[PDB]
Amino acid sequence: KVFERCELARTLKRLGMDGYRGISLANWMCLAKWESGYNTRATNFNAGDRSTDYGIFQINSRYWCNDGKTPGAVNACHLSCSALLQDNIADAVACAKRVVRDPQGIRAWVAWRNRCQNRDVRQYVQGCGV
């Protein structure tokens, strides 16, 4: 499913992402935008280390979910990576919450540092009623 901006913003708020571990809703929106373009079925194979990024938040199979083909991988979210390809993003949000519970926080995603960190991210939630 390809979410529309405000539709996603309202959904994330209801799932309790606003201010989770100090991360504002607009930062989560900026992250989803640059990671998948708000697309839940997005997958990206990384030929370099044989891991794959799954879903709206492009969560990596080496640490967070299990796809069985990634070498030396763990499954911290204790989910099948298939769970992160659903239209319903409940499981993806629960795993994202797990990711930021680690010391790096939102910085775990390099794309966040490149396209969101230290920028005016207000535009991602403007007019959405959140």
The nearest distance, CB 16 to Cl ion, in angstroms, is 20
Q: 1 or 101, CB closer to Na ion?
A: 101
Footprint of Na ion on residues 54-93 (CB under 5 A)? Answer: 61, 66, 73, 75
DSSP-derived secondary structure letter, 129: -
With beta carbons less than 8 A apart as the criterion, state whether 52 and 46 touch.
Answer: yes
Least separation in angstroms between CB 63 and Cl ion: 14
Give the Cα-Cα-Cα angle 84, 87, 91 (nearest 5 degrees): 40
Q: Which stretch binds Cl ion (CB under 5 A): 9-17, 65-73, 99-107, 122-130?
A: 65-73
Sheet-wide strand order for 59-60: 43-46, 51-54, 59-60
Does residue 52 touch Na ion according to CB under 5 A? Answer: no
What is the C-alpha to C-alpha distance for residues 21 and 106, in angstroms, rounded to an integer?
9
Residues taking part in catalysis: 35, 53
CB-wise, 43 or 75, nearer to Na ion? 75
Answer yes or no whether residue 83 interacts with Cl ion by CB under 5 A: yes
